[PDB]
Design a protein around this ligand. Structure first.
Ligand SMILES: [Mg+2]
Ligand SMILES: [Zn+2]
Lengths: 1111, 110, 104, 94, 14, 39, 263, 83, 158
DNA sequence: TATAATGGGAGCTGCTACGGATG
DNA sequence: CATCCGTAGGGCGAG
RNA sequence: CCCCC
């Protein structure tokens, strides 16, 4: 079909590699493809190079290397393995006394490898390392909140790489330095650095009254050695002030590059702020036996100049994106690698003392367990390592572009006020102002802008076009916020004739401030509107017509869209839906030009120009992290000529290379018998008939048979006391057969466990005697389908002990996995949503004859209530509906770019072209205007919609240009008394489905200590009746219902047992007893040496333990 | 061993031990089932004579908790051990017949 | 009788010893091979009660016909296992220690 | 809304006393098998089965209707508890 | 407040 | 809730607390919920 | 100290704190019997005091004792008692309960004010013992055990048990609750109407008191068991009996949205 | 004396209520020193004890109300007259 | 009752009020550069002018609705109380209005566009500040409200 | 069961606030 | 005036 | 924690 794209803005550059923030970060971190001699002291190299040489025998580092993965990605996902590469390090042990050298390549374990799409495979599960925003290291100057005319100087290094140092001018006049919560006069530390009164007087004397506050005679009287011992006594009281100890401590605190590490970004920020040059990333140096200052004097000078009001000195905006930086995958992984390496170095140093001081190899000295433990900890249990969201390809694409202010080394939720969550003016082009979580995490979790990229220092940069004179060049410069604040940047929609600015006055920004400016003052220009928003926000057509609060929900809900079996791209697109499928490697493309040799459901074989025959296997019905089916379908035919970059196979939720998160449905905006009341949605049974909004979901079940002290657990078809009807679909070994239908209660894998030793009750003795049948040795422990689940068995995986290639955890004989899939039709309670924030649950599925329909008999698909529009202020869905009606009758789709798209007159023109097809067809078929159409036109000209006196066709066209049509009620046949908006809308089926969330419980499992029901549907738990529910029951005065909640329905053991027996016997429920959690409270208070005594009216003790706890 | 207080999620809101059921204490269903078993057993034993039901109750432990030997039940009813063995066998015969007739105690065979 | 009041008060060492069914003299928990509780440990059945209802540890007495009996061989009282939620132990300190609640 | 809920609230000084009366009367009806009812055969609450009309098993509905009739007497200290229970068991045995 | 520092100080008095 | 004299036994303090707390999330030139808590 | 599903062992931190205490106490006794100097005895006594403090209120004084290879403070008795997760607020002033369920809500315009749409399977589970008794009264099952064994498998469920469940719930009401429960009308009593499908159907007029809408809200259902609780729910907690706000005295269940629009 | 809601709630006579509110250690130490007895007057105490709260159907005002049918009432009356 | 994009009716008075506000802003800037009023007074006068212009365009929207389209869907839903309030209808049909910086200080330039016309990326980014601030306000206010409710329950429960 | 060996080692909880007590 | 301790919404599904 | 209300 035809695809019409609007807009006159020409983007000189395409979108960057959308997952480059992960890929390039990890590639720079590993440096695997760089030959070892040619590497850069960064990442793993920098970590090795910081840890070594280990001095004490001397162990030094030569180079490292990474091997090939022992198993591919698919095998890792299959066998619960980590996709990783082996790491080796060539170390030479040197005896500086002997000159002896013993060199060896030691194995340091494995390091996880990043896949092509920017994710990891950890223990079989796909995971994403979310980038972390934080304060950039350096030297900042903030206003002192207590004293207005004074300031605080803050020296900040990298996280975990040293303390924060605070320089302040106290009220008494002396300058204080704050380190590790201790304060002291900065003059003492300056004297340790070798400064004398002459130097400080000549250096800082230009700022009048502060240098005298710096002067302290007793400190200048003593030489730097006495000053060093004095400072050590100040910082470490009680520690005997041995001079070497003081040297070591002060060096490790300030001058040690191993213990104090300003950032490379920190070093650059310090050099740029103070106007100096750093020889390293420490605040001072230990050179020629003494201490030499680096940072302290420039910072003190800047502080004094700022307090005196010296020009050219400013305070620092700490939320400015020039002072806030991103730590990506490489940096975090390298930090944990460095920690593990330091622990390994401690182990090495301890080994260099014990044992034989002569016979030692690098292999005997190195224990790699700390490093492996640190890396495994980071990748498994860190907060920034998250379970990959692969609901649809866009889910993971967005997940990899996430930016978190939380996590280790960052904010807690209470430490986040309004300042951090706020949208800063420097977020422009770097951080999306729209896409952020709704609720407690608002402002903390954000998303990277579309055109944004993180530089090597960690600062987000955005592109701008150079403007010389009045001519806009095609050269683009990626700027940080700090450099961006220098220029006057025009907007991207400023009129142009050729490369020349065609407007007498342009809209521009100066330090984020909007301004009207002459074309001579234009230094740069925005690349595109797309650069201001995230990838999810850029997929919302008519975004300029949507309120931000609802566009946020649209962006966040596109993530939750479920891949449909008949998924299709929207009729109104933004132009990004192809590139998103491209960069999210779900779809398959051709490497070079060539011809398709073979097309199958499982594979595609292509013969290229090179003559080489390349076979691409297709992923078919694979289960994602969230249960959605990831499967690739071929889109080419045998013998088809393809070019470089042509589509070969469609991934999940994609249609011919375009992003397909939902379906285009014919929607009518009108109330309907209260079934769309308060955002609820009414749909047509025709949607289920033609399998719209039908999705495939797979669930994975697992069971282990293990060795017990009572005997082996066995996976077998022989299960005690079970009929052949129960064992029908099980094979010889006890596993359910592939293709069988399983419902709640059915057996997936049969298993027997040896009965725990127990004496049969006398009742069981008599029963056994009456029936004369021996009680079996084993008990039925078979895995069964949980309530509400089931489907078709599509796969079975079995792993035993003693078969080639597999080894389980200790004690486990065998493990079986059963994959069950299900085709889910849309039903009442499932959740739908569009890209504009309109979301609702399906409340009614009407038959087709009850649906409102067009005059030509076409019924609508979805009925949306108009009451959801005015308060929400999201008009983009309305324009989408109008343009979708136009494209429904013209048989075409559209690309309406963001902030530069189809405007009202063009939509009116397309609607006129569509009305021609919609009405002249009827007029040629031999049909005139309908009577009910005439009545609706009467009521419409009463509404002022059509001009009185025109022909019925002219008035119907006037209504059609307003996007409104005559609609017939299928129940009566009479029309709706007014013209109604009808058109094509793109609606998605979200991951929240009633089938997953419906749950109920009569009785079930209870907790160990509290004896209260467990929680969760997966544990068959009960609903929590919290404090506020108890408050509700109290305010109602319902005492017996509340007591049932507190006793019979939970943790009153005798009470609940007697209640169940009485209800199954038809008797009324008994009087409740003491809750067991109260006895737990009493005993835990006794363990705290407090005597809690329940008394009667006579103040006599009452035993709620019933003599069981008293001797 | 691993701590019951091992956190689940990076919220402080849940523990590992909260997901661990109690397999020791009988569920309400199991206690109800055992009670119904005892009651159906007494209903079936009432269809015998007092003496031949008492023989079975004494031999299978429902009374006093111990399983008396044939000599002990015979000496309690004063009879010969073969005598008491015979009345026990005929009581079991009547029980099996009533069971094949009413099909009451079958569901408790699990 | 019906509970009408609840009193809370400090506990003398005498009252703490009157609660205790025995002294936990060992840091042991359960045996590494048998998985049964270690004698004089934190889970000892001689102190806190039987693991199984009306059944001693060694299994000499295994039914309610003995209740209140303490097995001479293994030293476990035959009662309901529920008592393991109720019966307290105690540790006799070699030196008095301050209750931190009344200090901090 | 429960039928005649306004008149039932009118009978009492406290709504919770109405609740107590209804609950205790339903307990009486359940314990004595509805044969202690003050209702007449045509006043008996009915329930529609697949077979047809049967007696309403819900004792609370029975009690509220009985209370609406006015043939029930409620109050405090009307009769010792044991004497009431025993005369009820004499008039309507288990 | 630090038991190890206190014990080391006590050790250093002999 | 019934436009009539309150019944003896009505938990009135709980109703007061709930009535004061329920609109708390709606309190926004104005001091608002900080002022309410200050009082 | 319990064995979990996979045979692994899980234990409380109180056991480790008690072990610390007992080890230090026995070592103090042995040092006293062997005539140790006063420095050693003093160190041991101070460690014993620290261990008792750790057992009673860990982290109260000094650094909190942690398990090896972990920064997680061990959970002492004070930690068990106090806090949002403490015994009082978590297990005494509120509990997880039996005979309760939860599901997504859907607008039920055809409902009367005193009614709510309840899914069939939710009702079968919530009223399960009543349903067993009714299946025993009718000839559907020989006894309660057979009725439960029959309900266990979903394919063994015939259509007479649905009629029996209709008979069971006759006249009774359930409690619907939506979090957050800001006022007493966050819980309301409704007569249930059994419905096919997995969604709870809520009356429109009560959506304002619950602050409920249908963009994905879920609600919990509870079954008052006794005749007393059922009477309390039907009289005091019924939705149709609470039409005015206890705060302002104004109408709370009143026309809104589409109703106001049409009128 | 005027004290805020927090201090007033912490100062209540019931130690179960105050200890379940906040500052559990302080409340419990002072209550254990004083040998305090909680009379179970309020709602939180009986909720903790799993008791029937003194409100609504649990109020002593309406709790003991009896119901009796006229047939049984008069049979009881004649039985009490003949004694 | 339905909602098309034409049901958000821009009053003819909007352009008049906007040109009047522009001439007034020019007068204020001229009276500033001649040094008659401070930067403070000029900023305050700009804010007040735009506030009054916003009120004027709101009244114009609703008067045009009342007189020429009394059965307009937005107007019907607002007047009946079914949905919407005057300020949201103003944002739909009039102007978006003044937006505030993260500091709470208000921008000199207002958002002249309405959601029917569509904003500019700059105006959208300017509004995002207030949107985020309101979100954080609600998120941090729910906890205080719940804490206060629990305090009141604990103090009044008996 | 014997060469001699003689004072630890992390490096935060790091971007909040507010008030009720005790010093 | 400092310093220590103490609170800081609820329910909910997965992993 | 992440998501939903
Ligand atoms: Mg909602
Ligand atoms: Zn024994």
């Amino acid at each position: 079909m035809e695809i019409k794209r609007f807009g006159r803005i020409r983007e000189v550059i395409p979108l960057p590699p959308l997952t480059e923030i992960q890929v390039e970060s990890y590639r720079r971190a590993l440096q695997a493809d760089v030959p070892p001699e040619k590497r850069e002291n960064v990442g793993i190299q920098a970590a090795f190079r910081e840890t070594f040489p280990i001095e004490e025998l001397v162990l030094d580092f030569l180079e490292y290397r990474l091997g090939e993965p022992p198993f591919p990605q698919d095998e890792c996902r299959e066998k619960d393995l980590t996709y990783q590469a082996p790491l080796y390090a060539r170390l030479q042990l040197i005896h500086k006394d002997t000159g002896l050298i013993k060199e060896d390549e030691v194995f340091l374990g494995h390091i996880p490898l990043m896949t092509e799409d920017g994710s990891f495979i950890i223990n079989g599960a796909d995971r994403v390392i979310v980038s972390q925003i934080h304060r950039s290291p350096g030297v900042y100057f903030t206003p002192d909140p207590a004293r207005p005319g004074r300031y605080i100087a803050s020296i900040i290094p990298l996280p975990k790489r040293g303390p924060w140092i605070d320089l302040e001018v106290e009220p008494n006049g002396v300058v204080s330095m704050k380190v590790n919560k201790r304060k002291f006069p900065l003059v003492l530390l300056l004297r340790v650095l070798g400064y004398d009164q002459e130097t400080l007087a000549r250096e800082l004397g230009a700022y009048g009254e502060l240098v005298q506050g710096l002067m302290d005679e007793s400190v200048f009287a003593m030489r730097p050695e006495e000053a060093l011992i004095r400072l050590f006594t100040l910082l470490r009281p009680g520690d005997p002030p041995k001079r070497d100890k003081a040297v070591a401590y002060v060096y490790g605190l300030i001058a040690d590059p191993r213990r104090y590490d300003l950032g490379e970004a920190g070093r650059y920020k310090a050099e740029e702020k103070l106007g100096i040059r750093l020889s390293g990333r420490t605040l001072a140096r230990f050179e020629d036996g003494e201490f030499k200052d680096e940072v302290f004097l420039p910072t003190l000078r800047y502080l004094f100049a700022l307090t005196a009001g010296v020009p050219g000195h400013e305070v620092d905006d700490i939320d400015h994106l020039g002072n806030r930086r991103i730590r990506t995958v490489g940096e975090l992984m390298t930090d944990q690698f460095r920690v593990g390496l330091a622990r390994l170095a401690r182990g090495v140093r301890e080994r260099m003392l014990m044992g034989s001081e002569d016979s030692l190899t690098p292999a005997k000295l190195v224990n790699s367990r700390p490093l492996e433990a640190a890396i495994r900890e980071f990748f498994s249990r860190s907060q920034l390592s998250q379970f990959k969201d692969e609901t649809n390809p866009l889910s993971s694409l967005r997940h990899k572009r996430r930016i978190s202010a939380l996590g280790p080394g960052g904010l807690t939720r209470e430490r986040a006020g309004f300042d951090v969550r706020d949208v800063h003016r420097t977020h422009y082009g770097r951080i999306c102002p729209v896409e952020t979580p709704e609720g407690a995490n608002i402002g903390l979790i954000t998303s990277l802008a579309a055109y944004a990229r993180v530089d090597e220092l960690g600062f987000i940069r955005t592109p701008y076009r150079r403007v010389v004179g009045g001519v806009v060049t095609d050269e683009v410069v990626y700027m940080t916020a700090t450099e961006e604040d220098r220029y006057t940047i025009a907007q991207a929609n400023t009129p142009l004739e050729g490369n020349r600015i065609a407007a007498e006055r342009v809209v521009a920004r100066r330090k984020g401030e909007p301004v009207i400016v002459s074309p001579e003052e234009v230094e740069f220009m925005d690349v595109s509107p797309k650069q201001v928003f995230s990838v999810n926000t850029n997929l919302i057509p008519f975004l300029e017509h949507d309120d931000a609060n609802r566009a946020l929900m649209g962006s966040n809900m596109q993530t939750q869209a479920v891949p449909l079996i008949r998924a299709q791209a929207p009729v109104v697109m933004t132009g990004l839906e192809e590139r998103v499928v491209r960069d999210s490697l779900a779809a398959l493309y051709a490497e070079e030009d060539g011809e398709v040799a073979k097309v199958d459901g499982n594979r595609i074989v292509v013969r290229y120009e090179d003559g080489r025959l390349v076979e691409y296997p297709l992923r078919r019905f694979y289960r994602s992290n969230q249960g959605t089916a990831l499967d690739q379908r071929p889109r080419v035919v045998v013998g088809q000529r393809v070019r470089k970059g042509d589509l070969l196979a469609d991934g999940p939720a994609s249609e011919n290379g375009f992003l397909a998160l939902g379906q285009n449905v014919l929607v009518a905006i009108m109330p309907f018998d209260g079934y769309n009341f308060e955002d609820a949605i009414v749909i047509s049974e025709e949607l289920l008939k033609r399998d719209f909004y039908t999705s495939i979901h797979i669930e994975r079940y697992e069971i282990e048979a293990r060795d017990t002290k009572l005997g082996p657990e066995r996976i077998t078809r022989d299960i005690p006391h079970l009929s052949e009807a129960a064992l029908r679909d099980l094979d010889e070994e006890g596993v359910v057969r592939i293709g069988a239908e399983v419902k709640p209660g059915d057996i997936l894998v049969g298993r027997t466990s040896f009965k725990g030793e127990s004496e049969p009750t006398p009742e069981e003795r008599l029963l056994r005697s009456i029936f004369g049948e021996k009680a079996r040795d084993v008990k039925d422990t078979s895995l069964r389908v949980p309530p509400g689940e089931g489907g078709i068995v599509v796969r079975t995986v079995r792993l035993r002990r003693g078969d080639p290639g597999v080894e389980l955890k200790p004690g486990v004989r065998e493990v079986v996995r059963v994959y069950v899939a299900q085709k889910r039709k849309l039903q009442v309670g499932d959740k739908l949503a569009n890209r504009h924030g309109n979301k609702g649950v399906v409340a009614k599925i009407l038959p087709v004859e009850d649906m409102p329909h067009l005059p030509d008999g076409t019924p609508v698909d979805v009925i949306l209530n108009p009451l959801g529009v005015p308060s929400r202020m999201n008009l983009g869905q309305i324009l989408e509906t109008h343009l979708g009606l136009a494209g429904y009758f013209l048989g075409q789709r559209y690309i309406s770019p963001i902030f530069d798209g189809a405007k009202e007159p063009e939509i009116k023109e397309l609607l006129a072209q569509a009305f021609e097809v919609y009405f002249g067809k009827r007029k040629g078929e031999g049909f005139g205007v309908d009577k009910r159409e005439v009545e609706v036109l009467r009521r419409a000209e009463k509404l002022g919609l059509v001009t009185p006196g025109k022909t019925p066709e002219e008035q119907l066209k006037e209504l059609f240009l307003q996007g409104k049509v005559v609609l017939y009620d299928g129940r009566t046949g009479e029309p709706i008394e007014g013209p109604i908006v009808v058109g094509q809308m793109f609606i998605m089926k979200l991951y929240h489905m009633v089938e997953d969330k419906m749950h109920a419980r009569s009785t079930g499992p209870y907790s160990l200590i509290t004896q209260q029901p467990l929680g969760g549907k997966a544990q068959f738990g009960g609903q929590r009746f919290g404090e506020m529910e108890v408050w509700a029951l109290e305010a109602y005065g319902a005492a017996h219902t509340l007591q049932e909640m507190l006793t019979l329905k939970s943790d009153d053991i005798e009470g609940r047992n007697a209640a169940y027996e009485a209800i199954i016997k038809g008797e009324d429920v008994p009087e409740p007893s003491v809750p067991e959690s109260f006895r737990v409270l009493v005993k835990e208070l006794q363990a705290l040496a407090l005597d809690v005594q329940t008394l009667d009216e006579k103040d006599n003790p009452v035993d709620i333990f019933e003599g069981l706890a008293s001797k | 061993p691993v701590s019951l207080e091992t956190p689940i999620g990076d919220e402080k809101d849940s523990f590992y031990g909260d997901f661990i059921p109690d397999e020791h204490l009988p569920s309400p269903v199991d206690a109800a089932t055992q009670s119904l078993l005892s009651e159906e057993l007494e209903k079936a034993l009432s269809k015998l004579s007092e003496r031949e039901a008492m023989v079975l109750k004494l031999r299978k432990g429902l009374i006093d908790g111990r399983e008396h030997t044939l000599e002990e039940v015979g000496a309690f009813f004063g009879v010969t051990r073969e005598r008491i063995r015979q009345i026990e066998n005929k009581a079991l015969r009547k029980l099996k017949y009533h069971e094949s007739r009413t099909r009451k105690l079958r569901d408790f065979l699990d | 009788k019906e509970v009408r009041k609840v009193r809370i008060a400090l506990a003398s060492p005498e009252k703490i010893r009157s609660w205790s069914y025995g002294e936990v003299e060992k840091p042991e928990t359960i045996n590494y091979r048998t998985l049964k509780p270690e004698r004089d440990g934190l889970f000892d059945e001689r102190i806190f009660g039987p693991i199984k209802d009306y059944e001693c540890a060694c299994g000499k007495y295994k039914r309610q016909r003995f209740e209140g009996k303490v097995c001479e061989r293994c030293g476990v009282e035959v009662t309901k296992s529920i008592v393991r939620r109720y019966r307290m132990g105690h540790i006799e300190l070699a030196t008095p220690a301050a209750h931190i609640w009344f200090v901090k | 809304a429960e039928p005649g809920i306004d008149k039932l609230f009118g009978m009492v000084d406290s709504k919770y006393r109405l609740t107590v009366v209804v609950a205790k009367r339903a307990q009486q009806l359940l314990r004595h098998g509805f044969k202690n009812t003050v209702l007449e055969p045509e006043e008996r609450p009915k329930m529609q089965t697949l077979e047809g009309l049967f007696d309403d098993p819900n004792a609370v509905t029975w009690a509220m209707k009985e209370l609406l009739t006015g043939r029930l007497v409620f109050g405090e200290n009307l009769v010792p508890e044991d004497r009431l229970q025993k005369e009820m068991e004499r008039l309507y045995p288990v | 407040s630090d038991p190890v520092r206190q014990y080391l100080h006590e050790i250093g008095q002999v | 809730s019934m436009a009539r004299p309150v019944s003896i036994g009505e938990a009135v303090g709980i109703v007061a607390a709930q009535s004061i707390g329920e609109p708390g999330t709606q309190l926004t030139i104005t001091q608002g919920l900080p002022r309410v808590i200050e009082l | 100290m319990v064995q979990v599903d996979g045979g692994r062992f899980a234990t409380s931190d109180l056991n480790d704190l008690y072990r610390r205490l007992i080890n230090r106490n026995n070592r103090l006794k042995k040092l006293l019997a062997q005539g140790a100097p006063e420095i050693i005895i003093r160190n041991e006594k101070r460690m014993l005091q620290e261990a008792v403090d750790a057992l009673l209120d860990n982290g109260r004084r000094g650094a909190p004792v942690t398990n090896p290879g972990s920064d997680r403070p061990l959970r002492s008795l004070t930690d068990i008692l106090s806090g949002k997760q403490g015994r009082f607020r978590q297990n005494l002033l509120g509990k997880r309960v039996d005979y309760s369920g939860r599901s997504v809500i859907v607008v039920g315009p055809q409902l009367k004010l005193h009614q709510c749409g309840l899914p069939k399977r939710m009702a079968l589970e919530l009223f399960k013992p009543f349903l067993l008794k009714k299946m025993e009264e009718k000839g559907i099952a020989p006894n309660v055990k057979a009725a439960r064994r029959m309900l266990e498998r979903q394919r063994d469920i015939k259509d007479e048990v649905w009629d029996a469940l209709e008979e069971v719930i006759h006249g009774k009401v359930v409690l619907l609750n939506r979090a957050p429960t800001l006022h007493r009308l966050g819980i309301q009593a409704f007569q249930p109407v059994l419905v096919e499908g997995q969604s709870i159907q809520l009356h429109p007029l009560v959506c304002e008191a619950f602050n409920a809408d249908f963009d994905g809200d879920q609600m919990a259902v509870h079954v008052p068991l006794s005749s007393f609780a059922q009477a309390e729910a039907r009289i005091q907690m019924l939705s149709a009996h609470n039409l005015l706000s206890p705060a302002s005295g104004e109408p709370l269940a009143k026309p809104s949205r589409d109703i106001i629009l049409g009128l | 004396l005027l004290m805020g809601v927090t201090k007033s709630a912490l100062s209540t006579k019931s130690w179960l209520s105050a200890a379940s509110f906040q500052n559990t250690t302080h409340v419990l130490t002072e209550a254990a020193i004083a040998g305090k007895k909680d009379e179970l007057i309020g709602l939180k105490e009986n909720v903790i004890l799993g008791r029937l709260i003194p409100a609504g159907t649990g109020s002593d005002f309406v709790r003991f109300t009896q119901v009796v049918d006229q047939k049984t009432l008069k049979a009881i009356e004649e039985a009490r007259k003949e004694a | 009752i339905t909602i098309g994009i034409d049901d958000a009716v821009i009053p003819e008075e909007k352009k008049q009020y906007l040109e009047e506000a522009d001439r007034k802003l020019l007068q204020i800037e001229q009276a500033y550069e001649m040094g008659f009023l401070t930067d403070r007074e000029r900023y305050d006068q700009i804010l007040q002018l735009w506030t009054e212009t916003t009120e004027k365009v709101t009244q114009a929207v609703f008067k045009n609705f009342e007189e020429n389209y009394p059965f307009n869907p937005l107007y019907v839903m607002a007047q009946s109380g079914a949905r919407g309030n005057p300020q949201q209808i103003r944002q739909l049909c009039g102007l978006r209005g003044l937006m505030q910086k993260p500091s709470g200080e208000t921008f000199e330039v207002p958002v002249r566009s309405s959601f029917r016309e569509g904003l500019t990326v700059l105006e959208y980014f300017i509004s995002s500040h207030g949107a985020r601030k309101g979100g954080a306000d609600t998120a941090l206010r729910t906890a205080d409200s719940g804490y206060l409710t629990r305090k009141l329950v604990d103090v009044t429960h008996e």
